[PDB]
């Protein structure tokens, strides 16, 4: 059967600024780059940045809610979010509707998130403060 | 410091067919559902389906190369691809890289992939046959 996420591939319009964002600003590990892409890891996540002439820099009001959240500890969350803020990283959401999260945009407008907590913890929180109509299996 | 992918959230135009696709066709575990979304797991992956009226059913020619690859064993790959084909799931790309890959679309046109092989495997293959301009770190 399917066993998890093998890799996340993001189309990027300019490779070097995107590599710098994920490696320098977000602290991900850069393993290789070539004329048309790069391979990074974030813990167990395999991230591929793929230079795509079709990728547009997309304002957050023009894209849907599809987004990618990265795990961070409770101890590191606030200072990492504040550092992104001080660095001028654009945002896309302010209301914490799914726990402790910071919502920010990559250079092409990919919707990203820092989040503290697992699925199990989110389900436990939702049992006390459920979303409308919520059923647990 | 970021420790991995926390969750992947896909905006969906209709919740019921998306739940059917990820739970029933793809075999993911459904943990909770509410009026405007669902939480599923696939191995370590926490997947959120978020009902979003802004989600367009998007032809693959009209979206960039951003995509989400799920892990499957070599032994299971061909029968899973055949299951998707029997269900009439559209393919958006043929495989031309190392490791088995099947490139398929979800009901809203999200670009998905079944892939066999890790980042370490890909890096080893690239070391032997580097892409144009490839540098390792
Ligand atoms: C070589 S381009 C690519 N590489 C890995 C994953 N997705 N795309
Ligand atoms: Mn999220
Ligand atoms: Mn891929």
| CB contact A36 to B (< 8 Å) | yes
| Alpha helices per DSSP H over chain B | 15-19, 74-86, 119-128
Give Cα separations from B124 to A111, B39, B68 (angstroms): 31, 35, 22
Domains of chain A: 1-137 (3.10.180.10)
Pocket lining: A7 vs ligand 1, CB cutoff 6 Å: yes
Token output for B93: 């790309």
| Pairing assessment for the beta strands B67-71 and B111-115 based on DSSP bridges | parallel
The alpha carbon of residue B137 and the mean position of all alpha carbons in its chain are separated, in whole angstroms, by: 27
DSSP letter string over A107-122? TT--EEEEE-S-HHHH
Nearest protein Cα to ligand 1, atom 1? A37
Q: How far apart are CA B104 and CA B123, in angstroms?
A: 24
Interface test with B, best of A38, A60, A65 (most B CBs within 10 A): A65
Contact A105, A57 (CB under 8 A): no
Q: How far apart are CA A65 and CA B54, in angstroms?
A: 8
Q: How far apart are CA A51 and CA A72, in angstroms?
A: 27
DSSP-derived letter for residue A89 is -
Find the helix or strand (DSSP H, E) in which A128 lies.
helix A119-128
| CB contact B9 to A (< 8 Å) | yes
| Matching residue, tokens 């084909």 | B85
| CB contact B126 to A (< 8 Å) | yes
Instruction: Name the resolution in angstroms.
Output: 1.3
Token output for B8: 């992947």
Neighbours of A104 (CB within 10 A): 22
């Amino acid at each position: 059967m399917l066993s998890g996420l093998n890799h996340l591939t993001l189309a990027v319009s300019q490779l070097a600024p995107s590599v710098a964002f994920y490696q320098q600003l977000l602290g991900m590990t850069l393993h290789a780059r070539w004329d048309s892409g790069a391979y990074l890891s974030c813990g167990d996540l395999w991230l591929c940045l793929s230079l795509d002439p079709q990728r547009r820099v997309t304002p957050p009001e023009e894209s849907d809610y599809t987004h990618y959240a990265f795990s961070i500890s409770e101890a590191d969350f606030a200072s990492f979010a504040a550092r992104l803020e001080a660095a001028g990283v654009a945002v896309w959401k302010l209301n914490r509707s799914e726990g402790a999260s910071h919502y920010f945009l990559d250079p092409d407008g990919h919707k990203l998130e820092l989040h503290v907590g697992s699925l199990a913890q989110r389900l436990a929180a939702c049992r006390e403060q459920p979303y409308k109509g919520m059923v647990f299996f």
